Amino acid sequence: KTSITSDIGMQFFDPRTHNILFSTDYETHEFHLPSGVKSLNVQKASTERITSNATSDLNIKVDGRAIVRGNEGVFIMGKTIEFHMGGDVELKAENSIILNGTVMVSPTRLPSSSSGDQSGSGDWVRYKLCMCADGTLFKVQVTGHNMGCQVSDNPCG
Amino acid sequence: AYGKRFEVKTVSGKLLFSADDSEVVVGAERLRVLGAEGTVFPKSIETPNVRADPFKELRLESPTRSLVMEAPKGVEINAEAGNMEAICRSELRLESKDGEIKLDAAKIKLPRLPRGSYTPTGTRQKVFEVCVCANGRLFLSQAGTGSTCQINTSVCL
Amino acid sequence: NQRPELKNHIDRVDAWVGTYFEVKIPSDTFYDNEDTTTDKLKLTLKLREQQLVGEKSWVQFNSNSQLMYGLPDSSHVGKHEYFMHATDKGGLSAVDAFEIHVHKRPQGDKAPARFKARLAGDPAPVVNDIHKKIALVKKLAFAFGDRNCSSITLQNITRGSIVVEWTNNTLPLEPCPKEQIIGLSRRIADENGKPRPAFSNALEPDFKALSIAVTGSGSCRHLQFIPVAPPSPGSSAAPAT
Amino acid sequence: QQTTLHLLVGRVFVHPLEHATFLRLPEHVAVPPTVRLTYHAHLQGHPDLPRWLHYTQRSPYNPGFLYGSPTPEDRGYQVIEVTAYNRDSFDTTRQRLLLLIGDPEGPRLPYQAEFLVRSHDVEEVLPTTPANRFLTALGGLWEPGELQLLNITSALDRGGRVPLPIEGRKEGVYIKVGSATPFSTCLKMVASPDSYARCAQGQPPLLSCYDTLAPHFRVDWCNVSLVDKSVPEPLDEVPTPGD
Amino acid sequence: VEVQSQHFQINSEDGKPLFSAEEQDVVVGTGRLRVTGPEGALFEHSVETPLVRADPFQDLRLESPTRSLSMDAPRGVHVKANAGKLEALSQMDIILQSSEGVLVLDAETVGLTKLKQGTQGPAGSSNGFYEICACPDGKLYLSMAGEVTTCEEHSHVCL
Ligand SMILES: *[C@@H]1O[C@H](CO)[C@@H](O)[C@H](O[C@@H]2O[C@H](CO)[C@@H](O)[C@H](O[C@@H]3O[C@H](CO)[C@@H](O)[C@H](O)[C@@H]3O)[C@H]2NC(C)=O)[C@H]1NC(C)=O
Numbered sequence: 001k002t003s004i005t006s007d008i009g010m011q012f013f014d015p016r017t018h019n020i021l022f023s024t025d026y027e028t029h030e031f032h033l034p035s036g037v038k039s040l041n042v043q044k045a046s047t048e049r050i051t052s053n054a055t056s057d058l059n060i061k062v063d064g065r066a067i068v069r070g071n072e073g074v075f076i077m078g079k080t081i082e083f084h085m086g087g088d089v090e091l092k093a094e095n096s097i098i099l100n101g102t103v104m105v106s107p108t109r110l111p112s113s114s115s116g117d118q119s120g121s122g123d124w125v126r127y128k129l130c131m132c133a134d135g136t137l138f139k140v141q142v143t144g145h146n147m148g149c150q151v152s153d154n155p156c157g
Numbered sequence: 158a159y160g161k162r163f164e165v166k167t168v169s170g171k172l173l174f175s176a177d178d179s180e181v182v183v184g185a186e187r188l189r190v191l192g193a194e195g196t197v198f199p200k201s202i203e204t205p206n207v208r209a210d211p212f213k214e215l216r217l218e219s220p221t222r223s224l225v226m227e228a229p230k231g232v233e234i235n236a237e238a239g240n241m242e243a244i245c246r247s248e249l250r251l252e253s254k255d256g257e258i259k260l261d262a263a264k265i266k267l268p269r270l271p272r273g274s275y276t277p278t279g280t281r282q283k284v285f286e287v288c289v290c291a292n293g294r295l296f297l298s299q300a301g302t303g304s305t306c307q308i309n310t311s312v313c314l
Numbered sequence: 315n316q317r318p319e320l321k322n323h324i325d326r327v328d329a330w331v332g333t334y335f336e337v338k339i340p341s342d343t344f345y346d347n348e349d350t351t352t353d354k355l356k357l358t359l360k361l362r363e364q365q366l367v368g369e370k371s372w373v374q375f376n377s378n379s380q381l382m383y384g385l386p387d388s389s390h391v392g393k394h395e396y397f398m399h400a401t402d403k404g405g406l407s408a409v410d411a412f413e414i415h416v417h418k419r420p421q422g423d424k425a426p427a428r429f430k431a432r433l434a435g436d437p438a439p440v441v442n443d444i445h446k447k448i449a450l451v452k453k454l455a456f457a458f459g460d461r462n463c464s465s466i467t468l469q470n471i472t473r474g475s476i477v478v479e480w481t482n483n484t485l486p487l488e489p490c491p492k493e494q495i496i497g498l499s500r501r502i503a504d505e506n507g508k509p510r511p512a513f514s515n516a517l518e519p520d521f522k523a524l525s526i527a528v529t530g531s532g533s534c535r536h537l538q539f540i541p542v543a544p545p546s547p548g549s550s551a552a553p554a555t
Numbered sequence: 556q557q558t559t560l561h562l563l564v565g566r567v568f569v570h571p572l573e574h575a576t577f578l579r580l581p582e583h584v585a586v587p588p589t590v591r592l593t594y595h596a597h598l599q600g601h602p603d604l605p606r607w608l609h610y611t612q613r614s615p616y617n618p619g620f621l622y623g624s625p626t627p628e629d630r631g632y633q634v635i636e637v638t639a640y641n642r643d644s645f646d647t648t649r650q651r652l653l654l655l656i657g658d659p660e661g662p663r664l665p666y667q668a669e670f671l672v673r674s675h676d677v678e679e680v681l682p683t684t685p686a687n688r689f690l691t692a693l694g695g696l697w698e699p700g701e702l703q704l705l706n707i708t709s710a711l712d713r714g715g716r717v718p719l720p721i722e723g724r725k726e727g728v729y730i731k732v733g734s735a736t737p738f739s740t741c742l743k744m745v746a747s748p749d750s751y752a753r754c755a756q757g758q759p760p761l762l763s764c765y766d767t768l769a770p771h772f773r774v775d776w777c778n779v780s781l782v783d784k785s786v787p788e789p790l791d792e793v794p795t796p797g798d
Numbered sequence: 799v800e801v802q803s804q805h806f807q808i809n810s811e812d813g814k815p816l817f818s819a820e821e822q823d824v825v826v827g828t829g830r831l832r833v834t835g836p837e838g839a840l841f842e843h844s845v846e847t848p849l850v851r852a853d854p855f856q857d858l859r860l861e862s863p864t865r866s867l868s869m870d871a872p873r874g875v876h877v878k879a880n881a882g883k884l885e886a887l888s889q890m891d892i893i894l895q896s897s898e899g900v901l902v903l904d905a906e907t908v909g910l911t912k913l914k915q916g917t918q919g920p921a922g923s924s925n926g927f928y929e930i931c932a933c934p935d936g937k938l939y940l941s942m943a944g945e946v947t948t949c950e951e952h953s954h955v956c957l
């Protein structure tokens with residue numbers, strides 16, 4: 001090492017013009033970013049927008065959790081949005097979820113009933129889904145056989 | 158100056174500057190960048206916090222590529238005062254290899270499902286219908302033939 | 315009725331520790347198709363999610379007159395976020411998120427004048443009641459004859475007896491202008507520190523006034539302003555080398 | 556791809572961006588109005604435009620606009636890259652522009668007036684025809700003389716407020732007009748302290764000479780900044796490199 | 799300690815430059831900087847980097863204090879977590895959209911927390927209601943409501 005100890009710190013100025021080119025008294029002389037930095041490691045970046053190059057991705061790599069908080073809404077756009085979640089996916093809104101567009105579901109993983117499993121005589125409580133005119137979903141109790149979505153009441157407001 | 162490490166510290170001991178082989182540590186309490194057209198960091202940034210100024214909006218955009226985010230321990234998205242919109246064009250995939258999907262909103266709408274068409278004879282493929290168990294777990298059952306959404310054994314609570 | 319639109323944002327409210335701060339919501343922040351102005355809507359303030367702001371919080375929102383007032387505490391330095399919900403008669407709500415900065419005064423320790431007023435009673439109810447603190451500051455401002463409460467910057471409240479110390483933000487930092495200090499001393503008390511009758515009338519009936527004192531700080535830190543001071547001894551550091 | 560343009564220091568330059576150029580649709584056909592585009596211009600090798608440039612656009616359907624008045628310290632060669640980004644097919648296109656900042660020609664313009672047009676927006680003034688119409692309308696009051704634009708800026712950049720859409724309220728623009736002939740008596744009277752005193756309490760601004768900008772240009776008359784550049788600023792001191 | 803010269807420089811032991819301050823501008827040659835101030839950097843307009851990491855802090859927090867955060871990528875947006883979980887919260891709405899494509903819900907079990915109930919009564923009007931069916935392709939479709947099952951009657955849609 002090559003150590004310097006002082007109450008203020010080192011200061012370097014050019015004698016030709018007598019302007020402090022680099023001072024360690026940060027309070028009096030603010031620090032300007034030196035050219036040539038390839039990477040930066042700051043405690044908090046108060047930026048405004050982060051962009052990649054004209055022909056490169058924007059990789060965001062972490063080791064713990066990533067927390068995203070838009071205080072007036074989070075908007076996502078693109079071509080194919082994917083969520084390769086290894087655990088649970090929990091969409092928890094408070095007014096409505098609008099699953100716009102064509103909806104699909106994997107049949108090979110969902111529990112699909114097989115033909116020849118009438119062993120259970122007890123008619124446990126079950127429901128059949130139903131699609132109202134406006135869009136709301138509602139379930140109806142199943143009692144007998146060969147029944148559909150005929151309901152006297154108005155469930156979807 | 159030569160050697161292996163050059164450092165500057167106060168009398169009590171505090172790294173105000175240290176230019177070793179790996180990195181250049183600077184003890185400034187706040188670094189300010191005054192570029193007008195922006196700054197370019199070829200390699201990366203390393204921060205534990207990103208925070209837009211209290212008059213603008215953060216925008217993580219990639220101009221002509223894809224945006225890939227990695228977070229092994231989990232991802233949380235919050236929008237305290239706005240819709241959590243997610244608009245795509247080709248395919249929106251929600252994956253959960255060994256988990257579940259939960260929708261806890263007060264109501265659910267799907268107002269673009271493909272409307273059916275009347276066919277006298279119809280087709281012979283078993284078009285499953287969707288039915289919900291007591292605890293809210295979905296399942297598929299064979300088309301109208303004898304029994305109903307019953308025949309489920311013990312896979313739901 | 316379509317939900318109200320957020321025409322104009324606030325996104326920032328600045329405040330300094332100690333001084334009374336208040337902000338009036340502008341007349342074009344919100345706009346509905348029918349009510350057409352924010353003053354006709356129902357404005358409310360919320361902390362986060364939908365939980366309400368407690369009455370003991372340092373920030374309060376007077377909804378009927380659409381005003382926000384507060385006196386930030388000494389330990390609330392930093393940044394906070396809030397939410398303003400506008401609800402119309404149709405039940406539709408529009409939310410604007412803004413942020414309040416609480417920053418220390420630039421003259422926190424360089425204030426030329428530091429005051430002191432002694433009041434009989436207990437300080438426990440006063441410290442833990444924002445309304446009582448606001449009333450005390452307004453009464454102090456009225457006693458001094460200045461209707462603007464923003465000048466007085468409270469600093470400390472002690473135990474045992476209610477001893478309150480403050481500065482005057484209007485007073486210049488350098489040099490210390492002794493003449494208006496002594497004029498305020500005459501208008502506030504006598505040479506021996508007994509309070510002026512106007513001061514006693516103004517402060518009452520909230521507390522009981524017994525005596526006040528005024529010391530120096532800043533450049534002329536070696537001067538006491540109540541006319542019982544031995545002002546000649548100052549730093550008294552004249553050694554010989 | 557690239558294009559070469561000529562610019563004069565201290566003058567307004569506007570280069571509208573249109574769907575026809577970027578989408579490269581056939582000339583004999585017209586681009587459908589339903590298409591949407593969001594251009595984003597930036598300096599080459601940098602993530603944003605320089606200080607003197609500005610980009611504006613009202614709606615994705617409407618064409619974009621690049622404007623701004625170059626500063627003397629920004630003279631030389633500049634490259635601006637524009638990245639059009641369709642919002643329907645989510646496919647992008649790129650283009651380049653070459654700007655050569657020249658130098659002003661002819662005598663200097665020492666008499667400048669900063670207006671405030673509250674009846675128009677920055678989108679409706681940038682095209683050539685409204686600017687020319689405004690210049691001809693203002694030529695009557697400033698006659699004799701020719702008026703050349705020097706600076707156009709949206710009111711929102713000057714600490715403005717978003718207007719309530721009640722009937723026709725708009726943000727408004729600031730237009731700076733320079734000329735070499737001295738102001739007439741009307742403009743001098745408008746800039747007199749009497750008008751400021753009148754609109755201090757709410758009295759209408761004093762106006763004796765006949766207006767021509769009305770009704771197509773509602774102008775805040777008692778807020779008009781007059782600047783005289785005669786007797787130019789003295790030379791600033793510079794340090795000589797020491798021995 | 800005052801250094802008065804024309805070109806200050808700090809090198810490695812071998813001789814590779816590490817830092818240099820002169821009249822032109824300061825230059826950092828090691829290719830890495832680190833500010834240890836609690837207030838951190840304060841940028842002005844924009845930042846252009848191809849990678850954002852979170853050092854050994856093991857936690858990244860993107861936040862917009864008073865406006866709407868928004869992501870964007872023309873080629874698509876990917877979110878990955880080998881052993882994590884997604885929790886999307888919103889006090890107003892959660893809107894998932896696809897202009898032309900599909901919405902794949904790949905999960906062995908999918909649960910619906912909130913779903914009301916409606917009494918089965920023949921007296922009500924059949925119009926204004928629909929029944930959801932899922933043909934072996936995997937897609938979902940609607941059929942006109944009725945007192946009996948009707949999924950097989952309109953099974954031509956996914957032929
Ligand atoms: C520019 O000129 C237009 C019209 O000529 C003004 O509307 C605009 O603001 C107005 O400025 C005049 C004086 O220049 C002022 O008398 C008007 O009202 C005052 O507003 C201030 C705001 O703090 C009050 O304190 C004061 O008591 C008056 O009411 C003011 N109009 C408004 C709506 O504020 C002019 N702008 C500028 C920057 O000069």
Ligand SMILES: *[C@@H]1O[C@H](CO)[C@@H](O[C@@H]2O[C@H](CO)[C@@H](O)[C@H](O[C@@H]3O[C@H](CO)[C@@H](O)[C@H](O)[C@@H]3O)[C@H]2NC(C)=O)[C@H](O)[C@H]1NC(C)=O
Nearest residue numbers: 454455458459460461462465466482483484485486494498
């Ligand atoms: C902090 O110090 C300032 C001194 O600059 C105080 O301002 C003065 O306050 C007094 C009483 O509050 C006012 O009377 C002063 O106004 C003037 O008063 C004289 C009589 O003393 C009149 O003749 C004048 O016409 C004028 O009205 C006022 N001075 C100024 C320049 O405004 C300020 O009050 C004090 N802070 C507090 C909380 O008292």
Ligand SMILES: *[C@@H]1O[C@H](CO)[C@@H](O[C@@H]2O[C@H](CO)[C@@H](O[C@@H]3O[C@H](CO)[C@@H](O)[C@H](O)[C@@H]3O)[C@H](O)[C@H]2NC(C)=O)[C@H](O)[C@H]1NC(C)=O
Nearest residue numbers: 052053054055056057197198199200600601846847848849
């Ligand atoms: C825009 O930014 C991207 C950032 O990814 C630039 O691409 C990158 O360019 C660097 C050159 O410094 C490449 O590094 C090189 O990689 C090769 C192969 O790994 C290696 O052998 C070299 O020694 C060097 O390290 C990097 O790979 C490359 N990355 C990608 C994804 O292309 C791009 O050049 C920038 N374009 C412009 C116009 O600025």
Ligand SMILES: *[C@@H]1O[C@H](CO)[C@@H](O[C@@H]2O[C@H](CO)[C@@H](O[C@@H]3O[C@H](CO)[C@@H](O)[C@H](O)[C@@H]3O)[C@H](O)[C@H]2NC(C)=O)[C@H](O)[C@H]1NC(C)=O
Nearest residue numbers: 097098099100101135266267268269893894895896897898
């Ligand atoms: C679910 O997604 C569909 C597909 O986009 C949404 O339908 C769209 O709804 C908007 C608003 O109702 C339509 O915009 C309107 O278009 C008409 C012309 O048709 C125009 O005159 C209006 O001024 C307005 O711009 C849009 O056309 C329509 N798109 C299609 C393909 O029909 C629907 O709104 C979404 N559902 C929800 C709840 O958001």
Ligand SMILES: *[C@@H]1O[C@H](CO)[C@@H](O[C@@H]2O[C@H](CO)[C@@H](O[C@@H]3O[C@H](CO)[C@@H](O)[C@H](O)[C@@H]3O)[C@H](O)[C@H]2NC(C)=O)[C@H](O)[C@H]1NC(C)=O
Nearest residue numbers: 564565566606607623624625626705706707708712713731
């Ligand atoms: C045309 O109008 C625009 C309106 O913005 C003028 O831009 C403004 O120019 C001033 C003068 O430079 C800027 O103020 C100060 O600039 C210095 C740089 O010299 C800077 O260090 C200060 O921090 C401060 O910004 C002002 O910021 C700038 N406006 C904006 C929005 O950036 C322009 O100068 C006018 N040009 C002519 C020829 O009239």
Ligand SMILES: *[C@@H]1O[C@H](CO)[C@@H](O[C@@H]2O[C@H](CO)[C@@H](O)[C@H](O)[C@H]2NC(C)=O)[C@H](O)[C@H]1NC(C)=O
Nearest residue numbers: 333334335336460461462463464465466483484
């Ligand atoms: C009370 O204080 C407020 C702010 O401290 C004053 O509002 C502004 O004060 C500054 C400087 O004190 C003036 O330059 C502004 O013109 C004031 N804004 C106005 C007048 O709209 C306020 O004027 C003060 N009131 C009194 C009676 O002192």
Ligand SMILES: *[C@@H]1O[C@H](CO)[C@@H](O)[C@H](O)[C@H]1NC(C)=O
Nearest residue numbers: 388469470471472473477479
């Ligand atoms: C005055 O305020 C300071 C703040 O640090 C506190 O430590 C001190 O105890 C206070 N003194 C009194 C008498 O309240």
Ligand SMILES: *[C@@H]1O[C@H](CO)[C@@H](O)[C@H](O)[C@H]1NC(C)=O
Nearest residue numbers: 016017793794795796797798
């Ligand atoms: C520039 O040259 C003059 C000679 O007249 C000299 O006096 C001055 O000191 C020089 N400037 C500096 C910064 O030394």
Ligand SMILES: [Ca+2]
Nearest residue numbers: 410411412864
């Ligand atoms: Ca806001």
